[PDB]
C-alpha cells in the first residue's frame, strides 16, 4: 500500500466496522537508553523538533483507525513511572475524561511525559486489565488496545533457575483472561530492543479461543530505506493486518456486545 489511507480502506474492505482504540504507553526507565542506535542516543520519550517513536506510532495507528471510531474517544494510559510501577496505570488526560481523537492524545502525552519519573518494573498486566474494564463498561463493544513499549516484560534476575517473573506470569495471565472480551491487543516494539525473544513469549501464552495478541517491531520497519508514506503504511498494515480476522472471531465466539460479569474493575490513577 502507498499510504495509510489505503490501509484504512483495506481494513474496511476486509470487514472492520465500528472499532474503538485504547492507547497504553510504557514510561519505564529503559526508554532513556534504548534509543542509542534507533533514535540518535536520545530518550525514546524525548520531546523535540521531530516526533519520537511513541508519537509516531500513535499518530500512524491513530490516523489509520480514526474513521472506524464513532465516538472518537480514546482512553490513554501510562504505566511504569514512579506512581504506577508494575501495579497500576495512570490516565494521560488531566481532566478526568477521555481524549477526543488521537490528536488530543498526542497533546496530553506531550504535556505530561516531561513531568514523569520513569521507573519500573515492566508489566503489561495493568494496562490489559484496564482495557478489559473499558470493554466491559462499553457493553462489549470491539476495542483495539495499542501497547507501545521499549522492552519486554521484566525478567527474573535468577538467570540460571528463575522461571517466569511475576511480571511475565501476570502479563501472560492477563492476555489469556483478556480473550474473554471483544478485544485485540497490539504490542508495538520501539527502540533497540532486543526484540528477538517475542516469538518465545508467544509460545508461552496458553491456548485461547482466539489469537487476541500480536506484536509488531516498529523500529525494524521505520528504519528501512523506503519512501516515508510507504513505510508508515507498512507499519500500519503490519500492526493491524490481523484485526479484521480477530474482529470476526469476536462474532463467531459470541463476544461482541456481550458482558462477562466478572471484569477486573481496574481504575486508573490521575496523571502525575
Cell numbers describing residue 269: 490513577
Residue 56 touches Cl ion, criterion: CB under 5 A: no
Which one of the spans 30-38, 80-88, 208-216, 264-272 is the region binding Cl ion (CB under 5 A)?
A: 264-272
Only one residue has cell 507499519, namely: 235
Angle at 249 between CA 76 and CA 23, to 5 degrees: 10
Separation CA 20–CA 8 (nearest Å): 14
Nearer to Cl ion, 148 or 239 (CB): 148
Min dist. Cβ of residue 43 to Cl ion (A): 26
Only one residue has cell 520531546, namely: 47
Element of type H or E holding 93: none
Min dist. Cβ of residue 124 to Cl ion (A): 17
Beta bridge partners of 90: 78, 269
Nearer to Cl ion, 91 or 141 (CB): 91
Which one of the spans 40-48, 195-203, 229-237, 262-270 is the region binding Cl ion (CB under 5 A)?
A: 262-270
The reply to whether omega before 194 is within 30° of 0 (cis) is yes
Q: DSSP letter string over 106-156?
A: HHHHHHHGGG--BB----SHHHHHHHHHHHHHTTS--EEEEEEESSPSPPP
Given 73, 153, 172, 268, the residue binding Cl ion (CB under 5 A): 268
Given 91, 133, 141, 179, the residue binding Cl ion (CB under 5 A): 91
Residue 133 touches Cl ion, criterion: CB under 5 A: no
Residue with nearest beta carbon to Cl ion: 268
Which one of the spans 17-25, 57-65, 66-74, 83-91 is the region binding Cl ion (CB under 5 A)?
A: 83-91
Q: Which parts of this chain interact with Cl ion (CB under 5 A)?
A: 91, 268
Amino acid at each position: 500500500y502507498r499510504s495509510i489511507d489505503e490501509v484504512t480502506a483495506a481494513l474496511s474492505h476486509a470487514g472492520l466496522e465500528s472499532s474503538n482504540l485504547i492507547v497504553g504507553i510504557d514510561v519505564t526507565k529503559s526508554n532513556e537508553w534504548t534509543g542509542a542506535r534507533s533514535f540518535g542516543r536520545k530518550s525514546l520519550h524525548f520531546i523535540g523538533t521531530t516526533p519520537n517513536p511513541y508519537q509516531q506510532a500513535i499518530s500512524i495507528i491513530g490516523k489509520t483507525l480514526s474513521v472506524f471510531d464513532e465516538d472518537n474517544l480514546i482512553p490513554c494510559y501510562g504505566f511504569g513511572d514512579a506512581t504506577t510501577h508494575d501495579q497500576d496505570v495512570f490516565s494521560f488526560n488531566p481532566n478526568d475524561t477521555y481524549c477526543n481523537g488521537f490528536e488530543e492524545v498526542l497533546m496530553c502525552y506531550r504535556e505530561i511525559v516531561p513531568q514523569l519519573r520513569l521507573s519500573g518494573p515492566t508489566s503489561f498486566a495493568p494496562i490489559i486489565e484496564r482495557a478489559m474494564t473499558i470493554v466491559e463498561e462499553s457493553g462489549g463493544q470491539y476495542h483495539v488496545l495499542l501497547i507501545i513499549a521499549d522492552g519486554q516484560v521484566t525478567r527474573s534476575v535468577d538467570t540460571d533457575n528463575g522461571g517466569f517473573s511475576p511480571q511475565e506470569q501476570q502479563t501472560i495471565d492477563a492476555i489469556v483472561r483478556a480473550s474473554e472480551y471483544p478485544l485485540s491487543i497490539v504490542l508495538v516494539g520501539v527502540g533497540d530492543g532486543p526484540w528477538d525473544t517475542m516469538r518465545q513469549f508467544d509460545d508461552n501464552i496458553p491456548a485461547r479461543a482466539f489469537d487476541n495478541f500480536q506484536f509488531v517491531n516498529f523500529t525494524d520497519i521505520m528504519s528501512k530505506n523506503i519512501d516515508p508514506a510507504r513505510k508508515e503504511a507498512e507499519f500500519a498494515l503490519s500492526a493491524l493486518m490481523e484485526i479484521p480476522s480477530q474482529y470476526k472471531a469476536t462474532l463467531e465466539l459470541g463476544l461482541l456486545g456481550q458482558r462477562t460479569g466478572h471484569c477486573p474493575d481496574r481504575i486508573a490513577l490521575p496523571p502525575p
